[PDB]
Design a protein around this ligand. Sequence first.
Ligand SMILES: Nc1ncnc2c1ncn2[C@@H]1O[C@H](COP(=O)(O)OP(=O)(O)O)[C@@H](O)[C@H]1O
Ligand SMILES: Nc1ncnc2c1ncn2[C@@H]1O[C@H](COP(=O)(O)OP(=O)(O)O)[C@@H](O)[C@H]1O
Ligand SMILES: Nc1ncnc2c1ncn2[C@@H]1O[C@H](COP(=O)(O)OP(=O)(O)O)[C@@H](O)[C@H]1O
Ligand SMILES: [Mn+2]
Ligand SMILES: [Mn+2]
Length: 1657
Amino acid sequence: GTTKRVFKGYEEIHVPPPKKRSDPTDQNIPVTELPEWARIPFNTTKTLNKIQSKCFPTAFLDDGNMLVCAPTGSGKTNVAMLTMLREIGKNRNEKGEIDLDAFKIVYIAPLKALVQEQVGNFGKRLEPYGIKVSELTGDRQLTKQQISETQVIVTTPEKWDVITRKATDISYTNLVRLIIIDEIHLLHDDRGPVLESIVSRTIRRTEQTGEPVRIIGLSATLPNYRDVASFLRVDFEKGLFYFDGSYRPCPLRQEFIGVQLKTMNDITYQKVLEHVGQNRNQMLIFVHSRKETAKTAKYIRDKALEMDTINQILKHDAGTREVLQEAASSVNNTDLKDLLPYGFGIHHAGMSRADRTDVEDLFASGHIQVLVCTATLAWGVNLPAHTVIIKGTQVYSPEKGSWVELSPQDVLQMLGRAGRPQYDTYGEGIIITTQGEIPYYLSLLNQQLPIESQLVSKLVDSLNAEIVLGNVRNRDEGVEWLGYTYLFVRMLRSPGLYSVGAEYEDDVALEQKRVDLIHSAAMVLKKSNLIKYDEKTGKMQATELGRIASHYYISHESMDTYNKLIHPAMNDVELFRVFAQSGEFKYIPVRQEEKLELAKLLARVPIPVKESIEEPTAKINVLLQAYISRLKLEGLALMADMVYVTQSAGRILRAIFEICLKKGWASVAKLALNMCKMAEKRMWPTMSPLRQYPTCPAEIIKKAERMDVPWSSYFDLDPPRMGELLGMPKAGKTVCALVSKFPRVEIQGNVQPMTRSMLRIELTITPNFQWDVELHGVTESFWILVEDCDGEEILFHDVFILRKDLAEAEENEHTVEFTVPISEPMPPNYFISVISDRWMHSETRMPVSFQKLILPERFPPHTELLDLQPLPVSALKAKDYAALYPNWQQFNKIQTQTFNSLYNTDNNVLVAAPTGSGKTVCAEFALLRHWAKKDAGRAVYIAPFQELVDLRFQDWQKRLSHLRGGKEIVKLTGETTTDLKLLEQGDLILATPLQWDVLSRQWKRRKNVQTVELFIADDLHMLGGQMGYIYEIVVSRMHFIRTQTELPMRIVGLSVSLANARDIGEWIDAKKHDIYNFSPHVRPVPLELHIQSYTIPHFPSLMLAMAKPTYLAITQLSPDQPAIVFVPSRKQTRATARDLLTACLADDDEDRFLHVEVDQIRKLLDHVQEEALAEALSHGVGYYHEALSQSDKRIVKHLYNNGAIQVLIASRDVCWELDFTAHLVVVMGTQFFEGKEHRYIDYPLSEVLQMFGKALQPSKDGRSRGVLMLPAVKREYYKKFLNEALPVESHLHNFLPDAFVTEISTKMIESGEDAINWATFTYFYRRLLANPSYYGLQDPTHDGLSQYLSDLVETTLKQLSDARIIEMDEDEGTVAPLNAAMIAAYYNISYMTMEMFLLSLSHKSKLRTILEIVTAATEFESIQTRRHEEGILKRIYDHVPVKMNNPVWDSAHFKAFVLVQAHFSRMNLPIDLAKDQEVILQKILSLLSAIVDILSSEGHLNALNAMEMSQMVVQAMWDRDSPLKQIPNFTPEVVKVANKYGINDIFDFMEQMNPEENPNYASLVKDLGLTQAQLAQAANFTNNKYPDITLPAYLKIHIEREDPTVHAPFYPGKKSENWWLVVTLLAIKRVTVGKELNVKLEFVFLMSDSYVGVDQD
Ligand SMILES: Nc1ncnc2c1ncn2[C@@H]1O[C@H](COP(=O)(O)OP(=O)(O)O)[C@@H](O)[C@H]1O
Ligand SMILES: Nc1ncnc2c1ncn2[C@@H]1O[C@H](COP(=O)(O)OP(=O)(O)O)[C@@H](O)[C@H]1O
Ligand SMILES: Nc1ncnc2c1ncn2[C@@H]1O[C@H](COP(=O)(O)OP(=O)(O)O)[C@@H](O)[C@H]1O
Ligand SMILES: [Mn+2]
Ligand SMILES: [Mn+2]
């Protein structure tokens, strides 16, 4: 068939196009009448093509991966469309809309032009669905992350591979459920390994976890289609489609020409003559250089100008000849293209998009006959031509430095443009090349070039990536990975061309081959320090250097050289030298033709180049410099080499910068970041910063750079002063805008010395620049650096992100808390710098001076843990006391050392020992001595949190209620009138600090408070906890009491190992020998503690990343013992359960943590209330968090203690309530997000010690284990305070208003001098002398201390008087409460909430007003905010009548405002939001009664609507509503059925449905549809639950009735029914009603609190 024709110079080979052969089988194309949802994208077509026909069934129904092969222009993108359509249908409602946050789809294309054309096409075609298609482009992660918040994303393989390597977007990467790979034949190219890595890791994860993501490959007509088909896991019967060149819509005639190359130009000119003059067909030529396009076009046109052949090519129509040049030459800006009046065109992507679209539209209209172009036009257009001419096939690739043949994908995409199907009946594709290249391209176009792997050239690096991801931990996992690559599939079959060696004859699945290959790669990876490699165990772990080598594409050799060369004294010269030394440019040669220009270029550059002027290193150096300087280069190969160098520089310089940053070298790090910016913005630091603005005209830059005004003098100016300073009035308004948007930040810093060697710094960053999305986007990144006074070492570094929402708000400031070490010969100062990550000259630098800093007191040694004889239980002189400890014959080493002081002495005692040592038995020693006394006074045990008092009560009530004739052990409750009688009725009272506070406030009254003889303060360190200031207050008040009354009162305190136990001891007035402060290493079961650091800036990605390491920790450190994993939130608890279950699925052991057969557990599993918890427990994991029901918690506890399940995942919010024990404790998170400040706050050391204190189960070696996973920045912090004792400091100085409100409500404090003596009884006062700088004390003198206390009490009294809570008589200097601190202390609401409650009474308060004012209380601001819980709040807000004045969607105020209304409307809620609603309902009643009393204090009578709202929220109803909602099972439709019968109130309902009365008993029972039991419950409510009985000039009132509780099944716990007495309206009285009452009120409306519609008028 092929005709060979030999000529003078060239040898033509014509291959005839095979016949269409399109109707041997009558495969009628589908009608494309699909459902209504899958038709709108196919706008301009009614019939699918022949290719899409056989793919439509599998595409639209079958989910399996597939691969189609066809010629270019055949219709593959439409089968990819069909796959996207099956997915959109998957995410579509029956007839409703589509949830677009549930799924993502990724389209991978080889070049940028194709991704842009594809994003445009798919945007147009998918816009009616609301789907937003976007291109994954950024120079920054801040752009790519926001681009990952879209539905379908189009990207290149390199960008996708690099965003997956960073692992900082896994939270969204997991949401992809479909991937399309266009032009897979790239696998043959040197970039194929990127595709290999992508698909290998994706398919491996899918086959491990079972989470399906569809893979569809669209390749070209090629031989090895079955290889890549199996490599994509497609079914050869149902997923593999292959089509001949006859399935091409326009058959392609192929002639090959082979010829140093002037004959090529002559042949192109003669073919232009033949095809445009004789055949009159427009044609396009493809060349491989932007300048060579116009070079060849100019040659052809000049050759046509001579010999007078131009009139054959030229069109002579009066229209074309007159319109073409008029609309093109007069409107073109390209000087070299301006030669287009002769029908010629150039299109090489180095021209304006305006000129580009003009050329394209002109070629489409038929005005251009010869269009010469680059490969950029081949990819991503819709411009076909009859004749395409690939002029030349050799191109320069600066990677290898040698001339390389053209990529086989470019020639195919080019020849695809040959022959427009609608106009032409055939196309012509010609390839001009050299003779020797003829057999290469022929076989390529005639389906004979096979695809081979190039992974061997990039294996090592790629392997390292899989190791940095945590996907490859050992050689076996690496072999599993390498078993999914294309190299493996190409090794299995046809291994001869690969130098396998043939020694692996019996290698069944090439297992040993992959093992050997991965070991050989990991050896080189280990030598270069990119990885730790256990050569024998097979274990391997990535390093920080390997992480840098993976996140950026840096080669292993280059990273090795960077590690070898970089040192802290490095300058800009040596930095450029290290850059040019990189191995990416070693093939780039220095040529003789380059020297004449290289000498000049080196003369121009500013940085000295010391290498030999003729060495490649100097060439690469001067190339980078000259690119920075924006020098014009008249050299072709030189320009190509520079383009390559500068494309690599972006990653090379960032890798160098991160290396310097992680080595702690400050100067080199800042210099490397500045060089990064130099190459990114293409400017030197000595040029004008205005060069960073693209819209800034060059005139301004030149004027500025010819000036000497420093950059800082541009800021804080207006347009007139700006123009005056700049010397250009016209520039005034312009430049002032640009500078106004330059990233600018003001910083402040506060220093508190935690210890003598570690300071804590609070940095306050406030942005000071106008935001603009064109150059800022939505976020702006910064670096926070902390340096020595010498600028030598980096003491702290982190990233700091400005969000556009947070940077534009009124409350504009951000806070950042960190810790830095310090040496006792203190340095003069530290430095803090906030430096932009992309902008140049954007740095705010602040000194932190230490001349005023005073370090805390040295710590004294811990008390020696003496080696005593373990005292037997018989040392107790009672048999019943010894029976309290069954089967115990001794006590531990610390219980015997405190025994004499606690059991034989009534002195005050302090015991400080690690968690889990047994301090409860010390408290029991004290209690046993107390109860031995015949008097046996009352004892009071206090614990920081109700969880702890409950755990203690459940134990002591069953173990000690039988001693010495029986003791009454009680625990307090919320309100006062009941636990006040529990105090008198009991001998041992357990309480929380606040509960006992409300009782000890009434001392010198309520005689039963002084009689307390024993006071146990457990977990005393928690005085520095969440609400620890009230704890400090109550213990100091007990001391003050036992000072006022002279009766003896013992105090015994228990805490974890302290660093400052002297002050806590002397505080409770304990003697020196009674203060036991043991080392934090004396725990009876030692604790092997591992620490893992994580450099991951995205929180969900960090959690997902830690997921698998904790599985490894559990399976390797505690393989046959229970483990407990703590997690930052209850929301993340189920997520971590699922992640750990999937990690179990990764190995072929799904029930790894399940030991008992599931059938025994099945009952409890059925009884689990949460379906996710039941699914987890089904496979032996389970979890525990505050939203769980009591039954769920008890089931989880029964399952974990019995050993049926091995792991237990608990949120950090339940670590005090968790009555569990493990051999291994994992601390996954160290931070938790607090929605109040929009930031992550660190775990307080208190709860880390608490969580690790549950690792009490030992092993063979007699020790327990813990692991602590944290961000790197935090490691040295926690590590420190896990090897040393815990410093406890007071925060009473930060809550003095809320303490004085209670000390002034009672007349304890009555003046300023009356408050200093109160402060002297506190722990804060004793701490002021030991750590004065922590609290702001300047001089450590009695004068200074007393003056500081005076200033503090005066500013607290000022905050209170300015808030209108107390009268402050400044003359006498006294204070008094004014009818508002009473309410505050009675309901214990915050003082800031009290001041906020002043906004009422202005005009007056209404129902809709009070509903909004209550939820604004600060108590609800503590409620957690789960990220991305918006929308489910807006949907609820749209379904409630009363609206907010100004919505703030992420505000806890708006959250409470909406949830209260959802409670009124009985709207269902998800579990976590329902828990938040419960928490709100717990306090809304207290807040509402406080508001009632506040309104009653003045004249206004809006408080009545507040009482109505109280009864509303009790009954979950609205103000105006049918009371029948209170009746059980009365859905709104039943209320409608009742209203149809004439029922309006519960009274009228009770009067109806009575046999022989109102004869509707027949139809009413039938229409209500209620069962007999529902009617019985309704009768239960209506009979004796809903009330029925009703009732200075003084008044007298009576009331009677026909009792214990209130019927309100939608409210957690409600005190018995109360009543209001309301006669600018004055009188109020609040009393409970029982059976009968007679009360007379004196004045100068009978309302309820729990039921509606019962109101005397
Ligand atoms: N069923 C059809 N009816 C009409 N035109 C079609 C049909 N299928 C594909 N085309 C057109 O054929 C051209 C080939 O484009 P495309 O299919 O995206 O490239 P490829 O064939 O390389 O996937 C497109 O411009 C498209 O509009
Ligand atoms: N490095 C940082 N600097 C400042 N704020 C941060 C930083 N990281 C997170 N934040 C805060 O946390 C929120 C982002 O939470 P996160 O889950 O980490 O990212 P995402 O925005 O993807 O949810 C932002 O509102 C931001 O204010
Ligand atoms: N002398 C002892 N020998 C063995 N186990 C003990 C001893 N004292 C306490 N325990 C165990 O310690 C657990 C409780 O420790 P706890 O008293 O809470 O210590 P801490 O209060 O310091 O956390 C109990 O389960 C108990 O069995
Ligand atoms: Mn394609
Ligand atoms: Mn304890």
